Design an enzyme around this catalytic site. Sequence first.
Site, mmCIF file in Angstrom:
data_model
loop_
_atom_site.group_PDB
_atom_site.id
_atom_site.type_symbol
_atom_site.label_atom_id
_atom_site.label_comp_id
_atom_site.label_asym_id
_atom_site.label_seq_id
_atom_site.Cartn_x
_atom_site.Cartn_y
_atom_site.Cartn_z
ATOM 1 N N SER A 11 -7.369 -3.213 0.817
ATOM 2 C CA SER A 11 -6.302 -4.030 1.412
ATOM 3 C C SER A 11 -6.201 -5.305 0.582
ATOM 4 C CB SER A 11 -6.673 -4.435 2.847
ATOM 5 O OG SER A 11 -5.750 -5.375 3.407
ATOM 6 N N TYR A 67 -12.447 -6.609 9.879
ATOM 7 C CA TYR A 67 -11.617 -5.915 8.912
ATOM 8 C C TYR A 67 -11.747 -6.568 7.511
ATOM 9 C CZ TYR A 67 -7.401 -3.664 6.996
ATOM 10 O OH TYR A 67 -6.496 -2.957 6.240
HETATM 11 N N1 LIG Z 1 -0.352 -0.109 6.279
HETATM 12 C C1 LIG Z 1 -0.770 -1.334 5.962
HETATM 13 O O1 LIG Z 1 -0.099 -2.338 6.197
HETATM 14 C C2 LIG Z 1 -2.076 -1.440 5.309
HETATM 15 C C3 LIG Z 1 -3.087 -0.579 5.591
HETATM 16 N N2 LIG Z 1 -4.067 -0.384 4.625
HETATM 17 C C4 LIG Z 1 -5.193 0.565 4.918
HETATM 18 O O2 LIG Z 1 -4.744 1.923 4.751
HETATM 19 C C5 LIG Z 1 -5.531 2.806 5.547
HETATM 20 C C6 LIG Z 1 -4.652 3.719 6.402
HETATM 21 O O3 LIG Z 1 -3.919 2.973 7.381
HETATM 22 P P1 LIG Z 1 -2.353 3.237 7.671
HETATM 23 O O4 LIG Z 1 -1.995 4.584 7.082
HETATM 24 O O5 LIG Z 1 -1.566 2.020 7.271
HETATM 25 O O6 LIG Z 1 -2.248 3.232 9.286
HETATM 26 P P2 LIG Z 1 -2.727 4.434 10.259
HETATM 27 O O7 LIG Z 1 -3.392 3.781 11.446
HETATM 28 O O8 LIG Z 1 -1.549 5.357 10.494
HETATM 29 O O9 LIG Z 1 -3.853 5.195 9.386
HETATM 30 C C7 LIG Z 1 -5.237 5.168 9.734
HETATM 31 C C8 LIG Z 1 -5.757 6.598 9.776
HETATM 32 O O10 LIG Z 1 -7.181 6.623 9.889
HETATM 33 C C9 LIG Z 1 -7.559 7.501 10.959
HETATM 34 N N3 LIG Z 1 -8.863 7.145 11.588
HETATM 35 C C10 LIG Z 1 -9.138 6.104 12.396
HETATM 36 N N4 LIG Z 1 -10.452 6.159 12.739
HETATM 37 C C11 LIG Z 1 -10.997 7.248 12.144
HETATM 38 C C12 LIG Z 1 -12.267 7.819 12.123
HETATM 39 N N5 LIG Z 1 -13.287 7.264 12.805
HETATM 40 N N6 LIG Z 1 -12.495 8.942 11.399
HETATM 41 C C13 LIG Z 1 -11.502 9.519 10.710
HETATM 42 N N7 LIG Z 1 -10.269 8.991 10.710
HETATM 43 C C14 LIG Z 1 -9.990 7.860 11.419
HETATM 44 C C15 LIG Z 1 -6.390 7.476 11.931
HETATM 45 O O11 LIG Z 1 -6.335 8.689 12.691
HETATM 46 C C16 LIG Z 1 -5.212 7.348 10.991
HETATM 47 O O12 LIG Z 1 -4.772 8.646 10.565
HETATM 48 C C17 LIG Z 1 -6.491 1.926 6.344
HETATM 49 O O13 LIG Z 1 -7.745 1.976 5.649
HETATM 50 C C18 LIG Z 1 -5.921 0.524 6.270
HETATM 51 O O14 LIG Z 1 -7.017 -0.384 6.265
HETATM 52 C C19 LIG Z 1 -4.535 -1.588 4.126
HETATM 53 C C20 LIG Z 1 -3.653 -2.460 3.647
HETATM 54 C C21 LIG Z 1 -2.289 -2.556 4.294
HETATM 55 O O1 LIG Z 2 -1.645 -8.590 6.012
HETATM 56 C C1 LIG Z 2 -0.930 -7.483 5.497
HETATM 57 C C2 LIG Z 2 -1.477 -6.185 6.086
HETATM 58 O O2 LIG Z 2 -2.858 -6.093 5.791
HETATM 59 C C3 LIG Z 2 -3.355 -4.810 6.058
HETATM 60 O O3 LIG Z 2 -4.674 -4.688 5.578
HETATM 61 C C4 LIG Z 2 -3.297 -4.518 7.561
HETATM 62 O O4 LIG Z 2 -3.706 -3.192 7.774
HETATM 63 C C5 LIG Z 2 -1.888 -4.731 8.114
HETATM 64 O O5 LIG Z 2 -1.926 -4.721 9.529
HETATM 65 C C6 LIG Z 2 -1.298 -6.053 7.606
HETATM 66 O O6 LIG Z 2 0.067 -6.125 7.941
#
Ligand SMILES: NC(=O)C1=CN([C@@H]2O[C@H](COP(=O)(O)OP(=O)(O)OC[C@H]3O[C@@H](n4cnc5c(N)ncnc54)[C@H](O)[C@@H]3O)[C@@H](O)[C@H]2O)C=CC1
Ligand SMILES: OC[C@H]1O[C@@H](O)[C@H](O)[C@@H](O)[C@@H]1O
EC number: 1.1.1.47
Lengths: 262, 267, 263, 267
Positions: B151, B164
Amino acid sequence: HMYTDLKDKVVVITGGSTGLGRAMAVRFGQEEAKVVINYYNNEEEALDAKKEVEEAGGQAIIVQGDVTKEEDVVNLVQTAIKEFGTLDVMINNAGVENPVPSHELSLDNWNKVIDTNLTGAFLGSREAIKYFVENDIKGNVINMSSVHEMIPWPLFVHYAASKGGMKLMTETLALEYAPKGIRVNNIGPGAMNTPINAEKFADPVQRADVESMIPMGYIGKPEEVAAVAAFLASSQASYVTGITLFADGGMTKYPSFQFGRG
Amino acid sequence: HHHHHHMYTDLKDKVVVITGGSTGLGRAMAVRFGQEEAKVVINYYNNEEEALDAKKEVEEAGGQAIIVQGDVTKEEDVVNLVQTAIKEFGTLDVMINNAGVENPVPSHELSLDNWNKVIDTNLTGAFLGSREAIKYFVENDIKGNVINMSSVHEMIPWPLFVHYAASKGGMKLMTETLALEYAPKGIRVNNIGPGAMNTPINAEKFADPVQRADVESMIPMGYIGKPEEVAAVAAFLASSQASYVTGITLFADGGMTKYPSFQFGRG
Amino acid sequence: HHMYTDLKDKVVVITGGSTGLGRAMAVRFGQEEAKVVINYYNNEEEALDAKKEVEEAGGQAIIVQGDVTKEEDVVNLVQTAIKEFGTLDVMINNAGVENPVPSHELSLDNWNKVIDTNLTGAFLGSREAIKYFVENDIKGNVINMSSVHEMIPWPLFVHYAASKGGMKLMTETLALEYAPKGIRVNNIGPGAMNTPINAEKFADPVQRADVESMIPMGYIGKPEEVAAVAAFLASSQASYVTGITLFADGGMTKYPSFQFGRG
Amino acid sequence: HHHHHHMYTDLKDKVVVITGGSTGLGRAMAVRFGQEEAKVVINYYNNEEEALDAKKEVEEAGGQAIIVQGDVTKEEDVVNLVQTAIKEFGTLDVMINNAGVENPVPSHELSLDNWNKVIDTNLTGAFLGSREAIKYFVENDIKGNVINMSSVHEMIPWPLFVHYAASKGGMKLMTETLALEYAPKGIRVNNIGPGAMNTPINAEKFADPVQRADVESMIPMGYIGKPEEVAAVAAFLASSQASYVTGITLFADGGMTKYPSFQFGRG
Ligand SMILES: NC(=O)C1=CN([C@@H]2O[C@H](COP(=O)(O)OP(=O)(O)OC[C@H]3O[C@@H](n4cnc5c(N)ncnc54)[C@H](O)[C@@H]3O)[C@@H](O)[C@H]2O)C=CC1
Ligand SMILES: OC[C@H]1O[C@@H](O)[C@H](O)[C@@H](O)[C@@H]1O
Ligand SMILES: NC(=O)C1=CN([C@@H]2O[C@H](COP(=O)(O)OP(=O)(O)OC[C@H]3O[C@@H](n4cnc5c(N)ncnc54)[C@H](O)[C@@H]3O)[C@@H](O)[C@H]2O)C=CC1
Ligand SMILES: NC(=O)C1=CN([C@@H]2O[C@H](COP(=O)(O)OP(=O)(O)OC[C@H]3O[C@@H](n4cnc5c(N)ncnc54)[C@H](O)[C@@H]3O)[C@@H](O)[C@H]2O)C=CC1
Ligand SMILES: NC(=O)C1=CN([C@@H]2O[C@H](COP(=O)(O)OP(=O)(O)OC[C@H]3O[C@@H](n4cnc5c(N)ncnc54)[C@H](O)[C@@H]3O)[C@@H](O)[C@H]2O)C=CC1
Ligand SMILES: OC[C@H]1O[C@@H](O)[C@H](O)[C@@H](O)[C@@H]1O
Ligand SMILES: OC[C@H]1O[C@@H](O)[C@H](O)[C@@H](O)[C@@H]1O
Ligand SMILES: OC[C@H]1O[C@@H](O)[C@H](O)[C@@H](O)[C@@H]1O
Ligand SMILES: [Cl-]
Ligand SMILES: [Cl-]
């Protein structure tokens, strides 16, 4: 003594009975602080540290605590508040390390280092900050990091990871609590003459090898880090929060690129 | 059928494991590796028909895909995921540790339970994933590839999300360390650092038009990222186009790490 | 057919475009069927050789002489690109120089030569391209060639290190300043690469192995591996990527002396 | 006479050269070093009377001071400064390159002349100073000390001030290089990274109450720093309290580099 504002300040130090924790305890003793020395299990060693603080001109108690146990960290802070009446500086110094090829590293061994080094510091920091917030005290938190919050460390991926997390943990807390005057900072020591390095520094080839990685040419004396702590804890550092102050004899500057190599 | 050219020909038939692969960035990555004719292993936590929906898309995009249930905080589930991939497809080429969670709590009020769930999921699960893949890569002399989904908050501190922030800062040093440890084997390890992206993790936040506007005001490029913009980055990093690239964090953030408040010469 | 379809017919200017990383980028953008403007200091025949390589790779190319330490040469270079190819899409500031000197013995003239070429040169190039992008509502792209030495300090090369350290903040500033306009500005940070900047060093077998010992991946980089990064950054694949330094260094910025649990 | 305590006993009678020593941060450092009973060489650009006042303050606080006119862009003037410090006081112990300038210009509008003035003053000036001090230190086997005045803007990008930001990013790598290069001789080289400080550089800006509050809103600690807060860091870095500290940037910025926009869990 040097920092007059540190007189009568209550300073809690996890791992405060050996190496860096103890040099810090002694130095805060030299500043006429009231030192709370946390220790894991060697009470006789903690008592020697207690004596040194008193001899140096401070007050000191000793409190057993496992920084991986929440109740222990809560007890540690409560005791400081009960025994000395307040809390001013919280120093999360306890940490451990051990070499394992990363693909061979067990979850238990990974967890031990994370829990001790990172989560230990979170708990300490949270308890200290909770007290400062509840009581409007412009308190201080010092987390003992390492050059390895910046320098990656093969065979010590658990350690490196713990310090990397500590960095963002400290920076986050510093930002969140800055408007209340609560300062939060890391110290990042290089190779230091402490028990964590005792076996390594016993071997004259390994000791010589570590030295060759220190641009200033010498393994640090624990009091050089204690000096950094006293500065950060003091009102000399009033505008300084969220930083990592490296005390490393040049380690983070990439020792292999000396002499125009590369 | 091979009725369209694909960008990274070297990704065709590569075995790619993606934790959290059924939603948000994980799914976008799954779909993109499919577009490149990869064999995608979609890990999911609970919603199986969502996972199957993603498997459908990977296939429709031109890839092969299986779904595998697993909790990344559970060690045996991680070992099982990596084992399933090798059994089903014959090998493992790319490990993508993408699963993660977050929630806002004033830090002086954050419970150990809550801190631990975030650290265990975000950071420790990524270590386990990485460890299992690198174990396999090492024992078989495979020049494999790990991608950890970090992130902007491995660099940007985040009040109310101290757990986080700590997890992502740990992932940085973990990734950088593995990269250094395994570089002489040609195993590459890299992070991606997304800014605000249009995914479920942000859905509640983005439903509120004032908050949506507030988040956009923190993105110098001025728009919330599309998940495929992050998958584009993973596709690049996983490919031999990034042959000399290891140990880095590639931010895809529309300029978030550049300090949004200092625009216009403020300060 | 090629990798980045969106790079077809894009106008790409490259300072130091006739040797080393510059030439490798020029050829690569040629493979993407771009229109490449090869800037060169004073080896005309080498620049002609490079032009021939771009064309054969499948692009169009012109060569334009210019010293990046001269404001009028940089202005002319960008103006020539617009006049000849009709527009400008990608500005690559790649020209740079270095030489070893104990810092306490480094002359001001020598300091200045490295600062003016490496940093102020990239400023001028960046300023001219952005001015064009802004006056004409174009969502253009700037790539500045930095180094691992925007992060890795470099005794005996303090002018060089300072130049790349400055370039980092320059690029990041411009990226922040122009992001609202859709103009992306990024650095590439290569490690040790096989180019003429290192020819004398690499002709010496002891130095060559010494440098290789500081690359965790175990080999001196091939110019094409950096050009691959440039193609990625210039393309719409990197649509959300701005203000970054993309190290392509085989692990050099990871501290090579800390391998094996040393320290 | 030694009729009052001071903090750093080892700073007594140390020779400390400060460029831009007659105003703002330079003046606060001059005075603080005077409080430590140091010998201060106050370099100043053109306002002689102001320099003489600063000289008086240093003396009143308990130090010795002389004033040396010099433009830090002029090689001979920087050479003269160090030689005058050595001639008048017999040696040189601490070199502080503090002179700096800035002005806001949209970057695509910024002239070469204006870019060069800022680069030459802020970066090149600091190089010449560091070079001359280190030359002396090396020739005479002195374990001397260099402090370069950087800024949060060696890390925080600064639209409209691209020249200033480059100059400070350049300073970072210059300082870190010199620190690595001369560490084996025990010459320490460090930067200070101040945030927004109450000095003449910000005078016009802070006299505008809305800009003043706007800047304050970007400082997490909630206040524009007092110059003596930077002086305190300089005293520390110059002393043997910082014996193991070299190559660093010590930010004293009220939290500015921690990304002020991400407060309250925004983003
Ligand atoms: N979308 C954003 O704004 C940002 C998110 N990212 C990162 O990207 C990754 C994915 O998040 P997103 O796709 O954005 O949202 P999301 O919440 O849709 O994806 C998270 C995924 O991880 C899974 N998960 C949660 N706990 C789990 C566990 N214990 N075991 C296996 N799977 C588990 C969820 O089921 C979900 O599919 C995360 O690591 C998040 O930190 C980081 C920077 C920005
Ligand atoms: O701050 C920008 C983004 O950072 C990510 O790591 C988080 O998952 C989001 O919730 C957030 O919007
Ligand atoms: N000495 C060095 O070269 C460097 C070490 N430092 C850090 O400094 C800190 C102190 O280590 P040193 O003084 O060097 O060596 P040390 O091993 O003497 O200190 C570690 C201390 O933490 C205590 N501890 C371990 N587990 C604990 C637990 N669960 N609960 C409570 N206390 C526990 C130990 O009993 C010991 O007192 C560590 O955090 C280490 O990571 C980091 C940079 C360099
Ligand atoms: N080769 C390496 O290991 C690395 C070099 N890079 C950077 O790559 C860039 C290109 O260098 P290489 O291709 O490696 O070696 P090179 O010496 O072949 O390239 C430098 C180019 O810049 C040109 N140039 C020099 N001064 C000029 C001037 N005043 N006006 C116009 N052009 C001028 C040279 O003629 C040459 O074409 C440089 O910016 C260097 O800092 C940085 C990281 C790694
Ligand atoms: N005040 C602030 O908010 C911050 C300023 N600092 C840095 O602190 C340094 C000092 O500035 P301040 O005391 O704040 O403002 P200031 O404008 O009072 O100090 C600058 C000093 O530099 C001198 N100077 C300018 N050009 C010179 C030249 N060519 N030769 C010799 N001297 C010259 C001026 O005469 C003046 O004494 C600068 O390097 C600045 O970039 C950096 C971070 C924050
Ligand atoms: O690498 C320098 C030092 O890093 C520290 O964090 C470790 O505790 C030491 O064992 C090591 O010597
Ligand atoms: O933005 C924080 C501060 O940065 C400093 O380097 C500048 O000199 C000040 O004018 C500015 O207020
Ligand atoms: O140190 C790695 C490399 O850095 C580059 O910036 C320099 O141009 C090379 O000469 C050097 O080999
Ligand atoms: Cl910000
Ligand atoms: Cl190194």
